[PDB]
Amino acid sequence: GMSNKFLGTWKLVSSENFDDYMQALGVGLATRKLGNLAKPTVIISKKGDIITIRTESTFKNTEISFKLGQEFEETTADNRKTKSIVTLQRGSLNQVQRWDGKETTIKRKLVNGKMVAECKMKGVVCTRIYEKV
């Protein structure tokens, strides 16, 4: 199952190409300016076989709870209503979001004790690095 090393609280320390990624999602300018300044905390928790990823920041809070391999309805930070799914691949915690015929991926993997989120949309790639805190 998900590695227990994911469990805990994570703080963003680096974000690369997040603006171009938000644009690819269709997020407008005012929202992107605040999104580019956000340094969110991400809390990953587990109750039985339901995993919860909770994102907290001054600008926006989000939370998804899910079971691996089971589609679920998601409301994203930019208020997209998506059909999403989280699965594992070589220990990486990979999320797909589908809506209005579009599709974006958020792959969260542990690299030397840090959590690295790789976000992809229409060939645009964003990388966000978190420290465990």
Ligand X SMILES: CCCCCCCCCCCCCCCC(=O)O
Note the residues at the interface with ligand X (CB under 6 A).
Answer: 22, 27, 31, 35, 38, 40, 42, 57, 59-60, 76-78, 106, 117, 119, 128
What's the number of CA atoms in the CB half-sphere (13 Å) around residue 53?
Answer: 22
> CB of 27: closest distance to ligand X in angstroms?
5
Residue nearer to ligand X on the CB measure, 48 or 112: 112
Q: How many residues does the chain have?
A: 133
**Minimum CB distance to ligand X smaller for 48 or for 116:** 116
106 is an annotated ligand-binding site residue:
no
| DSSP per-residue codes, 28-91 | -HHHHHHHHH---EEEEEEETTEEEEEEE-SS--EEEEE-TT--EEEE-TT--EEEEEEEEETT
21 is in an annotated binding site: no
Give me the residue whose beta carbon is nearest to ligand X. 35
Rounded least distance, CB 128 to ligand X, Å:
4
Of 48 and 94, CB closest to ligand X: 94
Q: Are 87 and 68 within 8 A, CB to CB?
A: yes
The annotation places the binding site for (9Z)-octadecenoate at 108, 128-130
